């Protein structure tokens with residue numbers, strides 16, 4: 001019940017007791033582990049508020065204080081009358097930073113306490129939403145010296161008045177299918193690129209066309225807005241050694257900014273809460289460029305390197321994969337845009353685990369997602385046992401709006 | 408109840424009913440996932456239900472469920488248990504059991520081969536010397552001059568856990584590891600503890616970097632005894648690189664036959680505590696883990712040096728670069744010497760095909776994603792994108808504690 005996790009590269013053992021404050025469910029049982037499955041009212045709301053407020057006031061060392069019981073009473077009262085309640089700004093910031101702290105799949109959480117929270121709960125319209133998101137983007141980008149941020153739009157009420165950003169990220173390239181066969185641009189975004197045109201977008205039909213924002217306020221029809229190009233920092237991808245690399249015409253955007261998740265604090269649901277930080281190198285080079293259901297450029301890069309592509313045992317895919325990722329990091333670093341390589345980030349996370357066990361009693365972690373998609377075992381997280389459990393406040397997935405909107 | 412797994416690269420979706428025939432626990436609960444944790448004397452009482460479950464399965468596979476042969480075998484096993492407190496497996500049942508234990512190994516990516524296992528019944532064995540002979544014939548047969556064949560040799564089952572057969576080596580063939588007084592390690596750092604045991608048991612250690620360890624064999628619960636595998640039976644491959652002539656000068660070699668010998672085979676409630684098994688290598692087992700783990704030979708540095716790489720900042724990905732060439736070299740050497748080996752792209756693709764076939768003909772295929780995904784280039788292999796259900800079927804291979812921690816010494 002006071003569990004241990006071993007690191008097998010160093011024999012360091014940590015005792016996890018934070019897990020006993022777990023709440024939500026894992027999807028697993030004693031008969032079946034689902035650790036690799038991608039996606040498993042007034043009476044319920046007050047215990048949720050209490051749990052949150054109790055830990056908020058513990059963190060500020062006012063557990064069982066006048067201000068504690070008074071806030072408990074105050075929120076209790078507001079729930080009894082309004083059937084919801086509003087977070088004090090301080091609680092909003094704590095709840096947001098801790099939803100990140102608890103993101104068991106995020107390798108970048110050593111930064112968790114430095115999150116910039118932008119309270120957009122006064123927002124009423126998609127134009128307003130657009131204004132906030134432009135401000136988010138410019139602040140986060142910071143001329144390439146990226147800064148973590150989240151912008152929190154009004155909380156759900158009756159599910160009919162939801163605020164949603166329909167894009168999965170604030171900044172993504174469009175996906176166009178071809179009359180002759182495959183796909184131009186980003187295949188992952190092909191359907192969304194439809195719903196943009198199919199909602200009135202005029203596509204440049206290029207390969208790296210920044211998608212427009214599709215913002216939904218108070219449950220209304222969503223609206224298209226183009227992010228000012230001067231706010232969208234991009235890096236052209238070149239190699240420090242192969243001058244033919246530039247001719248592939250590759251570039252990526254500097255700001256990863258997840259916009260389609262749901263943030264839960266003390267029972268309240270924030271359906272629009274775009275958050276952002278900075279890329280780990282492999283997200284772009286391994287996944288964005290080389291996944292088969294993505295830009296899948298491996299075949300062409302290896303040809304340009306004149307590698308024996310006839311048998312898998314030459315490991316030509318592996319060789320190319322390493323070059324592509326050397327180039328991504330090389331390009332971001334050259335243009336002074338923040339980026340972290342997977343060796344540095346996983347090492348940082350080990351340090352961060354150390355600290356969370358030491359000052360919090362544990363750190364929920366999803367090995368299937370922490371371990372980078374290349375060179376796994378030469379990173380320290382590979383040999384690190386992790387315990388996965390759902391703490392709250394949290395980010396959670398939510399249905400794609402086009403399936404849901406009472407249109 | 409039915410359960411669905413999806414492949415996020417191809418949208419193929421599969422329906423698992425086989426998890427319904429699941430027994431032993433996972434370690435997980437609805438509130439904790441232990442999916443990445445490495446490690447998650449039996450009476451007449453619980454034994455016959457375990458036997459009956461196994462015999463039921465066995466007779467279903469041969470399409471004789473409820474037959475007179477089936478019913479008489481149950482009755483015979485039942486009476487043998489109450490009479491003798493255990494029972495013996497027929498040859499046919501032992502073969503089925505071992506094949507299905509492999510088939511059920513949810514961490515094994517090589518399971519497409521599961522039905523082709525060569526089973527060696529060593530249940531008539533009684534002494535360590537007899538164990539040595541059986542193991543020598545396993546190594547000769549499985550090796551096959553480089554054209555490797557999968558095999559398992561099954562020694563007598565446990566009785567009161569005071570008379571266990573155990574192979575004390577973790578693998579039949581493994582290199583020695585020596586801790587030096589200066590703190591560095593000569594040879595394989597994984598094998599230092601076992602090497603000391605051998606040295607203390609009387610092994611004359613050549614104290615080289617690639618010394619094949621002696622077999623340390625325990626029969627019927629007696630003290631273990633040392634034996635040297637004849638060197639002409641140990642097939643080895645010198646590691647060279649197809650473009651880098653300096654690679655041969657690193658002096659590296661590896662043995663050809665991976666043969667796991669410290670696990671426990673469970674069949675119908677019987678426990679076979681010595682059951683060495685062997686197949687052939689995936690290239691990354693040697694090139695990524697054996698050479699490049701920090702707690703192993705750790706040749707990344709010296710390969711990086713000789714390649715002349717920017718070793719100053721990790722964001723040059725010099726480690727990744729060196730790792731790929733080392734794995735190119737392992738595959739190249741083994742193919743050049745016509746020793747069976749599989750690269751990780753080939754093996755993951757085969758597993759996916761195996762896995763789908765298992766869903767269609769069996770209703771599922773338990774799989775441990777954490778272990779199935781290769782330790783390099785994970786996402787460019789198809790298992791990365793494969794959702795997988797993990798659960799425990801029997802027959803099974805289980806871990807067991809190292810015998811030197813439990814054995815009671817005679818003298």
Ligand code: HEM
Nearest residue numbers: 100103105106107108111148149275276277278279280395
């Ligand atoms: C600052 C540097 C950051 C780095 C390097 C980083 C890195 C990563 C990586 C590699 C993943 C795996 C997802 C994938 O591969 O598609 C991930 C997931 C995630 N990140 Fe972080 N991230 C950072 C910042 C943030 C911030 C600021 C937040 C929120 C405040 C956040 C929340 C999450 C969540 C919730 C997930 C997992 C969502 C899920 O369950 O799918 N991250 N991150």
Ligand code: HEM
Nearest residue numbers: 509512514515516517520557559684685686687688689804
């Ligand atoms: C024939 C080709 C085979 C290949 C390519 C192969 C490959 C692998 C690999 C790469 C692992 C991961 C273990 C690690 O990386 O440390 C593994 C695990 C395993 N393999 Fe296979 N294997 C093969 C044959 C066999 C055979 C013949 C058996 C038994 C009859 C077997 C039983 C197992 C078991 C029980 C595990 C579980 C390991 C554990 O839980 O620690 N394998 N295999």
Ligand SMILES: Cc1cc(N)nc(CCc2cc(F)cc(CCCN(C)C)c2F)c1
Nearest residue numbers: 038108256257258275276277278279280283
């Ligand atoms: C803030 C941030 C930092 C970073 N460095 N990187 C990312 C992108 C990784 C990511 C984070 C996340 F929270 C959700 C998704 C959606 C994918 C879910 N799966 C179904 C594919 C993501 F891609 C986000």
Ligand SMILES: Cc1cc(N)nc(CCc2cc(F)cc(CCCN(C)C)c2F)c1
Nearest residue numbers: 445665666667670684685686687688689692
């Ligand atoms: C039959 C076989 C084929 C293959 N191609 N490769 C191997 C070696 C991989 C392996 C398989 C196994 F069943 C147990 C261990 C010991 C590791 C135990 N850990 C807990 C430290 C292994 F290394 C075995």
Ligand SMILES: C[C@H](O)[C@H](O)[C@H]1CNc2nc(N)[nH]c(=O)c2N1
Nearest residue numbers: 382383384385443444445777778
């Ligand atoms: C902590 C973690 O479970 C441990 O390092 C595991 C991870 N996955 C693995 N996968 C394989 N194939 N082999 C291993 O030794 C391991 N080790």
Ligand SMILES: C[C@H](O)[C@H](O)[C@H]1CNc2nc(N)[nH]c(=O)c2N1
Nearest residue numbers: 036037038368369791792793794
């Ligand atoms: C099937 C499996 O769950 C799926 O491929 C997961 C595996 N691990 C991952 N890890 C990261 N970081 N990102 C991902 O999208 C995934 N996908």
Ligand SMILES: [Zn+2]
Nearest residue numbers: 028033435440
């Ligand atoms: Zn689990």
